[PDB]
Amino acid sequence: IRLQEDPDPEDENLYEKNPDSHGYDKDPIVDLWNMRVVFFFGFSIVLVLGSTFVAYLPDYRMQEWARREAERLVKYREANGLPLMESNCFDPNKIQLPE
Amino acid sequence: MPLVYMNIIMAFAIALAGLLMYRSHLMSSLLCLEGMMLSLFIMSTLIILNTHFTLANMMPIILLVFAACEAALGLSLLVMVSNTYGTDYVQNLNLLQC
Amino acid sequence: LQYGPLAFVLGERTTRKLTETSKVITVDGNICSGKGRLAREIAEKLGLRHFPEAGIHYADSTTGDGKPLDVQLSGNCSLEKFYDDPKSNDGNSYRLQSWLYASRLLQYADALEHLLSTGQGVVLERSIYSDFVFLEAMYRQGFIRKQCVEHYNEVKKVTACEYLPPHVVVYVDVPVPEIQSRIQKKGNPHEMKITAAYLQDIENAYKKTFLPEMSEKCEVLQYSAREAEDAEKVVEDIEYLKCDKGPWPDQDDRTFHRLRMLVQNKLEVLNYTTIPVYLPEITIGAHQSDRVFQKFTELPGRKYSPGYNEDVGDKWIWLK
Amino acid sequence: MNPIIYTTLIMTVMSGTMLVMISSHWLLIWIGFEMNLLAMIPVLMKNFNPRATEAATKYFLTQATASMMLMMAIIINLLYSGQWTITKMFNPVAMTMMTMALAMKLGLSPFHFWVPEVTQGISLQAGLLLLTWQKLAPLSVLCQISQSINPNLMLTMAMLSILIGGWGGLNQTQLRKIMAYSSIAHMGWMTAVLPYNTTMTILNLLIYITMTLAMFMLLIHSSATTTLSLSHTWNKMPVITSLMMVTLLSMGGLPPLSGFMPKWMIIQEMTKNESIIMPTLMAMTALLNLYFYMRLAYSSSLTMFPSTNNMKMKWQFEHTKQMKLLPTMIVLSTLVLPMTPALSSLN
Amino acid sequence: ARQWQPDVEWAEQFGGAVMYPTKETAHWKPPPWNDVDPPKDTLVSNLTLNFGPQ
Amino acid sequence: MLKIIIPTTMLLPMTWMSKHNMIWINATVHSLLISLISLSLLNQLGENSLNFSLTFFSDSLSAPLLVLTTWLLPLMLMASQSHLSKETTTRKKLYITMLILLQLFLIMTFTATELILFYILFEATLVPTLIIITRWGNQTERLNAGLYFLFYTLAGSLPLLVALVYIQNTTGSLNFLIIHYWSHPLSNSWSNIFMWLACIMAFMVKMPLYGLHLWLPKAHVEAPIAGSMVLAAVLLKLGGYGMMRITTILNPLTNYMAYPFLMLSMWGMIMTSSICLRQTDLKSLIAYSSVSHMALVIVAIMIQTPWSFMGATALMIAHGLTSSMLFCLANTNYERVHSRTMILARGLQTLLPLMATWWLVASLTNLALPPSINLIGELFIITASFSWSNITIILMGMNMMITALYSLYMLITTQRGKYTHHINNIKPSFTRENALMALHILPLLLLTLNPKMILGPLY
Numbered sequence A: 001i002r003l004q005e006d007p008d009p010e011d012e013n014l015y016e017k018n019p020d021s022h023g024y025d026k027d028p029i030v031d032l033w034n035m036r037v038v039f040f041f042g043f044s045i046v047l048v049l050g051s052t053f054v055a056y057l058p059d060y061r062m063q064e065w066a067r068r069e070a071e072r073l074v075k076y077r078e079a080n081g082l083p084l085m086e087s088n089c090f091d092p093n094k095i096q097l098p099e
Numbered sequence B: 001m002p003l004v005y006m007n008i009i010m011a012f013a014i015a016l017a018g019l020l021m022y023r024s025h026l027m028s029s030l031l032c033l034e035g036m037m038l039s040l041f042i043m044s045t046l047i048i049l050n051t052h053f054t055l056a057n058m059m060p061i062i063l064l065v066f067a068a069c070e071a072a073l074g075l076s077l078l079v080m081v082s083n084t085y086g087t088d089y090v091q092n093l094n095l096l097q098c
Numbered sequence C: 001l002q003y004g005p006l007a008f009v010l011g012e013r014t015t016r017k018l019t020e021t022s023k024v025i026t027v028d029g030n031i032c033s034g035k036g037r038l039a040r041e042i043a044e045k046l047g048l049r050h051f052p053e054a055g056i057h058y059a060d061s062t063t064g065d066g067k068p069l070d071v072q073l074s075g076n077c078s079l080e081k082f083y084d085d086p087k088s089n090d091g092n093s094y095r096l097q098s099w100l101y102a103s104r105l106l107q108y109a110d111a112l113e114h115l116l117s118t119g120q121g122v123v124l125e126r127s128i129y130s131d132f133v134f135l136e137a138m139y140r141q142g143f144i145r146k147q148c149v150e151h152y153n154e155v156k157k158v159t160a161c162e163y164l165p166p167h168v169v170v171y172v173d174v175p176v177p178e179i180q181s182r183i184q185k186k187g188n189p190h191e192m193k194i195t196a197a198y199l200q201d202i203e204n205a206y207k208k209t210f211l212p213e214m215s216e217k218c219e220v221l222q223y224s225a226r227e228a229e230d231a232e233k234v235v236e237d238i239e240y241l242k243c244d245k246g247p248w249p250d251q252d253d254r255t256f257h258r259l260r261m262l263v264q265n266k267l268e269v270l271n272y273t274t275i276p277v278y279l280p281e282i283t284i285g286a287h288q289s290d291r292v293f294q295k296f297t298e299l300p301g302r303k304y305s306p307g308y309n310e311d312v313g314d315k316w317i318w319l320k
Numbered sequence D: 001m002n003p004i005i006y007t008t009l010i011m012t013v014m015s016g017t018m019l020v021m022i023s024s025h026w027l028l029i030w031i032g033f034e035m036n037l038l039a040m041i042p043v044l045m046k047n048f049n050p051r052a053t054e055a056a057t058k059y060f061l062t063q064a065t066a067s068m069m070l071m072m073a074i075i076i077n078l079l080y081s082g083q084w085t086i087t088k089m090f091n092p093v094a095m096t097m098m099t100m101a102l103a104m105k106l107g108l109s110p111f112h113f114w115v116p117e118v119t120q121g122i123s124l125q126a127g128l129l130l131l132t133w134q135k136l137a138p139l140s141v142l143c144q145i146s147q148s149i150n151p152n153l154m155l156t157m158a159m160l161s162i163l164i165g166g167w168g169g170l171n172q173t174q175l176r177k178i179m180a181y182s183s184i185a186h187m188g189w190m191t192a193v194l195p196y197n198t199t200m201t202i203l204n205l206l207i208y209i210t211m212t213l214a215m216f217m218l219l220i221h222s223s224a225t226t227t228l229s230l231s232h233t234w235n236k237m238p239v240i241t242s243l244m245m246v247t248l249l250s251m252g253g254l255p256p257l258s259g260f261m262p263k264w265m266i267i268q269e270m271t272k273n274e275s276i277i278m279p280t281l282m283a284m285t286a287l288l289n290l291y292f293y294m295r296l297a298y299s300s301s302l303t304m305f306p307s308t309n310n311m312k313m314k315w316q317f318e319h320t321k322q323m324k325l326l327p328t329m330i331v332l333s334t335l336v337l338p339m340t341p342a343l344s345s346l347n
Numbered sequence E: 001a002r003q004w005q006p007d008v009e010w011a012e013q014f015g016g017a018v019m020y021p022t023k024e025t026a027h028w029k030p031p032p033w034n035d036v037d038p039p040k041d042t043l044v045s046n047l048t049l050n051f052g053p054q
Numbered sequence F: 001m002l003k004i005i006i007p008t009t010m011l012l013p014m015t016w017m018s019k020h021n022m023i024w025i026n027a028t029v030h031s032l033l034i035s036l037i038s039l040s041l042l043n044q045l046g047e048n049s050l051n052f053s054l055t056f057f058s059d060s061l062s063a064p065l066l067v068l069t070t071w072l073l074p075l076m077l078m079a080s081q082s083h084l085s086k087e088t089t090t091r092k093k094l095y096i097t098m099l100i101l102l103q104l105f106l107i108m109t110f111t112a113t114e115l116i117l118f119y120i121l122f123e124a125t126l127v128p129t130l131i132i133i134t135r136w137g138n139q140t141e142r143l144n145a146g147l148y149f150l151f152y153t154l155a156g157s158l159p160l161l162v163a164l165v166y167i168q169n170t171t172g173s174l175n176f177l178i179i180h181y182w183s184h185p186l187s188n189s190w191s192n193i194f195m196w197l198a199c200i201m202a203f204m205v206k207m208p209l210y211g212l213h214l215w216l217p218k219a220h221v222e223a224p225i226a227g228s229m230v231l232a233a234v235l236l237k238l239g240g241y242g243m244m245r246i247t248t249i250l251n252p253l254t255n256y257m258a259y260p261f262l263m264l265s266m267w268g269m270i271m272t273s274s275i276c277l278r279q280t281d282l283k284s285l286i287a288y289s290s291v292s293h294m295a296l297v298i299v300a301i302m303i304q305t306p307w308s309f310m311g312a313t314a315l316m317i318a319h320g321l322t323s324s325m326l327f328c329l330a331n332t333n334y335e336r337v338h339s340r341t342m343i344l345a346r347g348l349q350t351l352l353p354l355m356a357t358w359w360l361v362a363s364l365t366n367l368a369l370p371p372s373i374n375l376i377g378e379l380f381i382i383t384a385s386f387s388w389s390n391i392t393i394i395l396m397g398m399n400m401m402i403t404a405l406y407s408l409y410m411l412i413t414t415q416r417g418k419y420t421h422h423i424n425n426i427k428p429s430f431t432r433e434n435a436l437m438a439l440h441i442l443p444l445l446l447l448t449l450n451p452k453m454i455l456g457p458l459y
């Protein structure tokens, strides 16, 4: 041997001292409460509440607004015989091309 | 520029090349170091005396004073090195490496 | 203020502090001699401070509380085990020797600090310079290795080169048969396991190396058992050793300043006792080192600095 | 050395540097350099041993040669202008001589060998004073005469310094030589930015001085001069190793630590002057310095090396002397990146 | 079953005179622990003088 | 963003002031609370970004990445407390401090509105990661892995700093909004080519590009479980976010300069999948799978179409979740048998049934199984590549086949067959491990339910 070194310790099993262990801590009470807070907060609060919050987020992306605007535009343009999609994005009168 | 200035600058260059090229003795390099300041003294006084810079006449004296301080410092280091190694050879100053 | 360069500038001078009875006296002898009794008598009669032999746990006695620490935390070596199995396979013998050398070095620093800060002389039951005799005895009996001896010599060089040797060296000469008789009468089994060749090696080292070496430095007084029994004549012989050819007369105020600055700092004293020389005997693995250091930190009055340990009843920490 | 003599020699070194910094006359600047060297030699030789004597001899020879070349440059400038004031130099040859002399004083490559040799020769306190103060003076002179500096010569010596520092530090295993090569590289960075912004030169000088003071004081606290000596410090005071690791990360230039600020500002300033190849090469070459800083950090803090048996006694005892401003140097060298725009105050 | 930590082989690879040894650098040796080299046994060589007979 | 930034900097003192046995509980609970708070960033706009202040802004690209980072922190805490039982309290708190610092840097990285502040933070993420790897890794090779990771990233990113300061000098600003509104075409010149190279090479190294990827197996195999989780799930996505952001100023030069990188990405996607087929180590298999998926994301960014960016965003989020889960499963196996070899532990379905179910679900998501967001992103990238050229479909189909092959090979090797006879210490799965897998996998399927939340700004 080249050193005064400790032997490699045996692996510690959490189920030996505490058969009904959750794997969080050596102390039974701390282990139980760690399980409880993780399950409650994570699953209940974050999963359920965040999923329902995201489901009912207000329509700030303007999908339904854009659909209603498109319906108004289509109704007006087909009533008057105009093309449904304008051929140009901008006004050629406003655009000044080089000679 | 006159040829006198050329000769003095040449003497300084010769004394500088002498210092940078050690042979064995530390004393010889110290003598080369003292020659450089002698050439500096001569060049400075030639420049000052020609231009009649009256208040600058004291500058070569200060130059000599600090030449003396350098020579004293070098001789002190030389005696310490000789006490340690038995000779003033520069080959013995090899304990420290780059 | 504590001693420092400012105190030196202000005017604290060791030469002025000393009273010409400030002598370092070291008593030596083989295993189980009367050196302890003679040293106690010398310290008592001359008015000097006695320093018992620095074994294991001396550093424990000088720090924290005086109580010794666990052997796992202070020394990690056993004198009884060295007696039982001198040729162990875990390097116990050289671990013990190196730890005892470090302890003797620390005790010598303590004694020098006391003398320089007080002017009162000290009587050590053994010094740095007598420590190698057990190293030579171990080497000649095959207990330790040449590498162990070389490491010891390196550390001893770079450490003991820095201090002032004793003023007086008092050696008590006792023959090996008498040593064995006294050991047997004492009745301790571990020291009863000591072989006669080991005791002869220590005496050979003392007579051939230590005593001739200390004769050049200063004067050496040698006594037999009968002469050592009568300590009055020993003290009388000490009191009339007017000659002093050691470095102490050559010592000046600046040299004393340097020495006192050295000896008041215990971490600088032991700086070279831990050099990265990886002998299998003394080297300790990372995991064992971490575990033992954590345990020492968990000790009662050791987690913080001495004035800042709340679990031992230190108050006003928040304003300290 | 007597404490009074030591403090008067330290004050004389500082007085020579201050004379250099406050003088407006080339003769007075030369006098300041001479006074600094004269009082600096005994400081190197304070602890007498052959290595200290050799280091002092090499330092004296190099500095005397540099001072001689500097005085020659001064006299040549006086010949062609009749001016003693320190301003733009009127002769290109005198300017080249002055640049060579000041570079030799600073240790810029190819004038660098004395830096690792002397630093390994002298103690930790002497090396700290050497690096810090003896870089402080010539750089002030260079900043004063910056407007006449030849950019090609200055930048060549700066890039050489960066490369040489990186490579030497890669090879070294002694802490003092590591510090010396790191110093060479940092001087390279400062003098690279010098012909464009002396303000950035000053900023790099201050940050380098802070990091070097913290590093040297940590080494002095831990009493470690080699890699393996520093590998025992985790078993005595694990806090010092952690602070040293953070300081080493800062020195390597990793964001968001204070070592990133000088490199960042210098790269930006040189880019403003249409320099791209030089900043890119300088930034890439600093990876060598970071590599040997990280090699040092593995041994001391991120891994646990074997210890010895007398470390137990060392545990029992306590460190007595208190380093002055060590916590402040640790904090300033790692956590002042959000305070970057104070370089305008530095301006 | 535990984290690996450096051993004597690792430490000794880090404890040479220099990293990356060559022939010359392997002939080199690491400096002393206290930076004090052992004294060299130089010869004083006092001058020897014949004082007399003439 | 301060309502999310300050609670992290308050996780720090809470971690250092809590009791010795409450550190894990406190850190986990308050990380979950901060994740819940960060869920409010998903309410984005259709026109522009959420410009909180002069320093921070959020977008449809930043918001899912922030949510993923904040959600990943408590999972890393759970795995860490699994493997750090015997540590001292101070070192446990230091580990939690490194994790919290990494999360804070990542948050400010995704929300930084300037390219230079983004650079500072995205380089600041290196220090906690390097410390975690080289300090709390198990094997000898953690040191070399840390060196490789650090120097690859820095060699990539230093020319990026030079290019960024050059662009600031040229245009007056590094603000993302200003450089978007004031962008000009990049003319075909050598100077522009090297500017393009500086930027893209920084992020390609961070991605990694095939051929610049060796640091990834080195670091991901040798890091501890939390290090592996954050390296794969989030730190690989700094490259994608940066490449998406910085390509505003690189057009039209991206049309001509993307050929070498597209070729490297497609062929290296094939090559890394084939490597996965023949790996004797489980962690290396997961790492090379990460490389293949990031190659697909690089292809998407380089072809640079509205359909490719949406696929890239979806694939980045999905890969983060899936790779983190796979690393956690492998780590549970390792904590049983203390070896990373894949054929050592077999029959784990007949020894641990619920873990076999978790393995099945993670491997079903790793290969693109519809309608998972993994498949959604992969399919959008494949469609955009098909519009780019019609042989990209050949390469993409080969990659999908090999991906299914190696995923099911890993599942069959570890879980099926007969158990190793002499491994008699396979204790029943812990509630902590089961909950970790559930918390990895349920958000993925919910994201399948609502997919517009991870399709990026181009949606």
Ligand SMILES: CCCCCCCCCCCCCCCCCC(=O)OC[C@H](COP(=O)([O-])OCC(O)COP(=O)([O-])OC[C@@H](COC(=O)CCCCCCCCCCCCCCCCC)OC(=O)CCCCCCCCCCCCCCCCC)OC(=O)CCCCCCCCCCCCCCCCC
Pocket (backbone or CB within 6 Å): D238, D239, D242, D243, D245, D246, D256, D301, D302, D334, D335, F012, F013, F016, F017, F088, F089, F090, F091, F094, F097, F101, F127, F128, F131, F135
């Ligand atoms: C505020 C919380 C922290 C936030 C940090 C953010 C950044 C701040 C930087 C500066 C922080 C201040 C300085 C702290 C120094 C602490 C040193 C120490 O002894 O620590 C242990 C010490 C307790 O242990 P101990 O009893 O001293 O025993 C020590 C033995 O070593 C125990 O024996 P042992 O053997 O078990 O211990 C060995 C251990 C002992 O080692 C240590 O303890 C060393 C710790 C690191 C050194 C300090 C580095 C400073 C430079 C800046 C970077 C710091 C980042 C990490 C900060 C860690 C803070 C502890 O060493 C190791 O295990 C080696 C590990 C090597 C790798 C890790 C170390 C380096 C980490 C840093 C590098 C990464 C930086 C990334 C870049 C970004 C930076 C922001 O911890 C503390 O005292 C905690 C400090 C904070 C207390 C709370 C303060 C706030 C109170 C409430 C405020 C409320 C405000 C109002 C709110 C509104 C409602 C009212």
Ligand SMILES: CCCCCCCCCCCCCCCCC[C@@H](O)O[C@H](CO[C@H](O)CCCCCCCCCCCCCCC)COP(=O)(O)OCC[N+](C)(C)C
Pocket (backbone or CB within 6 Å): A046, A047, A050, A051, A052, A054, A055, A056, F039, F064, F067, F068, F071, F317, F443, F446, F447, F449, F450
């Ligand atoms: C025993 C079990 C057997 C198997 C049973 C499960 C398998 C069946 C799955 C198929 C049934 C699905 C049920 C669908 C019910 C309808 C609800 C769903 O459709 O709503 C979704 C809503 O989306 C969901 O909320 C998905 C939320 C995504 C998860 C949010 C994050 C949760 C926190 C965790 C953080 C993880 C971060 C990861 C990176 C972001 C989709 O949007 P939408 O239908 O139109 O909303 C309706 C409300 N409106 C009308 C007002 C608009």
Ligand SMILES: CCCCCCCC/C=C\CCCCCCCC(=O)O[C@H](COC(=O)CCCCCCC/C=C/CCCCCCCC)COP(=O)(O)OCCN
Pocket (backbone or CB within 6 Å): D015, D016, D019
């Ligand atoms: C802490 C001491 C004071 C600090 C001063 C504040 C810092 C300023 C820098 C130092 C300046 C010192 C002043 C000395 C310069 C005097 C120059 C001068 O004015 O000339 C004389 C000054 O008068 C004197 O005689 C002064 C004599 C002083 C002698 C004693 C000085 C003490 C020096 C102590 C040595 C300390 C070593 C310093 C370190 C080296 C230098 C850095 C006046 O001549 P006049 O003929 O009147 O000119 C008008 C013409 N009709």
Ligand SMILES: CCCCCCCC/C=C\CCCCCCCC(=O)O[C@H](COC(=O)CCCCCCC/C=C/CCCCCCCC)COP(=O)(O)OCCN
Pocket (backbone or CB within 6 Å): A029, A030, A033, A034, A037, F007, F025, F029, F033, F034, F037
């Ligand atoms: C629909 C949503 C409504 C949900 C409301 C939830 C509010 C909190 C309810 C759950 C809290 C759990 C504990 C409740 C009361 C404690 C019960 C008890 O007495 O047991 C304690 C429980 O102790 C704990 O485990 C600590 C957990 C309780 C404190 C942590 C919850 C604090 C969270 C604050 C939420 C506010 C955040 C809002 C701002 C958002 C920030 C981003 C003792 O256990 P130990 O200390 O582990 O035993 C060892 C002693 N020898």
Ligand SMILES: CCCCCCCCCCCCCCCCCC(=O)OC[C@H](COP(=O)(O)OCCN)OC(=O)CCCCCCCCCCCCCCCCC
Pocket (backbone or CB within 6 Å): D323, D324, D325, D326, D328
């Ligand atoms: C103008 C000079 C500035 C620097 C002076 C530094 C002097 C002290 C140097 C030693 C190291 C720091 C002190 C550590 C504790 C020392 C032992 C102790 O118990 O000290 C008690 C002391 C009490 O303070 P006290 O001395 O009464 O204050 C001055 C009164 N005239 O406790 C203290 O003094 C502790 C607080 C010290 C002051 C904070 C540290 C410096 C702050 C600098 C602010 C600017 C930031 C940039 C600094 C750049 C570097 C200087």
Ligand SMILES: Nc1ncnc2c1ncn2[C@@H]1O[C@H](COP(=O)(O)OP(=O)(O)O)[C@@H](O)[C@H]1O
Pocket (backbone or CB within 6 Å): C030, C031, C032, C033, C034, C035, C036, C053, C079, C096, C097, C100, C101, C131, C134, C135, C191
């Ligand atoms: N350096 C050393 N190595 C090994 N053993 C030592 C060393 N120094 C002292 N000892 C042991 O310590 C004990 C001290 O006994 P000692 O004081 O000599 O007896 P006494 O008090 O009768 O003189 C002895 O048994 C001796 O073996």
